[PDB]
Design a protein around this ligand. Sequence first.
Ligand SMILES: CC(C)CC(=O)C(=O)O
Ligand SMILES: CC(C)CC(=O)C(=O)O
Lengths: 335, 335
Amino acid sequence: IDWSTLGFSYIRTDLRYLAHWKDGEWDAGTLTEDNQIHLAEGSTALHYGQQCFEGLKAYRCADGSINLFRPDQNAARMRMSCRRLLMPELSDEQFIDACLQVVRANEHFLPPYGTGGSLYLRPFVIGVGDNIGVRTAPEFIFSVFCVPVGPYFKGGLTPTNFITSDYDRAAPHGTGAAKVGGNYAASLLPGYEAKKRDFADVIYLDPATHTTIEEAGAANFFAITQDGQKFVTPQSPSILPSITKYSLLWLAEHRLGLEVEEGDIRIDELGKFSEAGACGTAAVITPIGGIQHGDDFHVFYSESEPGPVTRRLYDELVGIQYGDKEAPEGWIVKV
Amino acid sequence: IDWSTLGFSYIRTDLRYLAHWKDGEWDAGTLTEDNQIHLAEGSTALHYGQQCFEGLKAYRCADGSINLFRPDQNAARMRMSCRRLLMPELSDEQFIDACLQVVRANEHFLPPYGTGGSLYLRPFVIGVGDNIGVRTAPEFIFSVFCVPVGPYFKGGLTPTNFITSDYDRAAPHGTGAAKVGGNYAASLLPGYEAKKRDFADVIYLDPATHTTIEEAGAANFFAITQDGQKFVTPQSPSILPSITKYSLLWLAEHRLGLEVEEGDIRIDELGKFSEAGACGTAAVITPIGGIQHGDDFHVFYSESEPGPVTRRLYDELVGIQYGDKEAPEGWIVKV
Ligand SMILES: CC(C)CC(=O)C(=O)O
Ligand SMILES: CC(C)CC(=O)C(=O)O
């Protein structure tokens, strides 16, 4: 109701989309009001961690129209998750369609242009059915629910700090690059410890020889060279391939005129970048004040303000989302 | 209701234990018959793999008594589990009791003696109640149900084969040591793969550098050196601490006389053992004819019969299970 004090917490919205896959196929799908999910006490979703999901948003423009930011990329990636866990995939039709039904029905829950709100969509897939063994499963449920949400862990483009961990949230040859609940389960601990010290989160390093940056179990990482000319994100099979990263990495080259590089970043060489931040749907480029790596707090630009490049990447990206700045063809679906 | 034909399949028993946890405390915990858990769409257990479980069996003796095997260990382990994922822990009291209750109530589903059957118990804790952002759930569920079962991927001691993997089921410093859903979500794919080519399951090697052996799908690994005089089992901060392995590791030394050693084992130096196999609960010392690693296929004893020492360890353990031998201290509880 009040978009002022709106945060990234849960809120029950009128209706949500639901569909079952049994005997080789998905039902037509329908909007329900249940809010609760019902599954066997032996469901693979509960014991063996066979679950996957997405996070996309819907924004309200100053024209009246509703924007969807690259839904096609979300549908795409889930197919990737679904695979990794022997789960049936969903077409870009059943997906975008779901999201559209779940926004149209809950349209009154969409924050109006002005306040930085947005309608978050959490599409998820879990294996159900009676079972006990370590196999896939006889059935599945695909659901899409939304909640009005403002900033995740930021505010007004204001920066925030991060600290490294000893723990690994994803393995070298694991599901680290898939949005499957497993990865996150392993982040809770190191992430909570990271919060008890008034930090934003935790930046995990390569599983093996923790020497280079991965991401933040909540968003990707990206810095900028001192001569503020190059945009950089680490490349690693273990990090989730963010729609936002790949997007930022796009404007970075064609709209802001910057050199771009996907490659390694040593925690041993932070002073190579002038300003750094994390990115994501709920993350939405978040200035990174400093990084603690033991006896070492490293501050790029300001700890109270964002760098100029971080702001340009923000104002451009966010414009596209709310329809303030012409968006590349193909991105953003009207509603 | 024929036990001669019974395997690791879900059968709906009569009653389940169902305790909650709200506002810092666990409910009393009654029994019911719904085998349909009821979560909240935002459940932490559905999206972030906030979940762990246990595995223990209840067996019926010759004389008439019912044996519950080392339930105290399962209780402790499931504590370590919950701890790693920020979930409230159940004490031996609440735990061990929860089992018993289920054991009794469903006593007719306990296989008779002489069938080599058993009543499988599945205790598990999951995060429930509304949520969204990545953080521990607000409320928690703990439940226990049971099901009768013959053996696992075997029957008798006839062996089976295993294949190495390039994938990894857990990161060096991930959650391999805890029995949590993510673990299995990832041991799902390489499984399907292996079983597709007629291997019992894949045997994971080593997150960072696949030189040593971790464990298999749902079982630890153990071997006997060539002189059949020493017992060697892998030791790493990322493999689940099997109770079984720990138990054989106790017998091998006393009841059997052998020398023990927890250390490393290189797939290279593989013919450095007379026999080997995989222990565990549903598993139950599963011999190993040979191991497919790369091109060459290595075979310790044979693909047809268990190594003598493996046989002994089998009988010694199982005898203790059904009481035809003599269980050590605290090892067994009489329901
Ligand atoms: C959109 C993300 C930044 C939010 C999140 O916690 C996720 O996607 O897992
Ligand atoms: C106790 C285990 C050996 C049973 C099982 O199948 C598992 O844990 O996945």
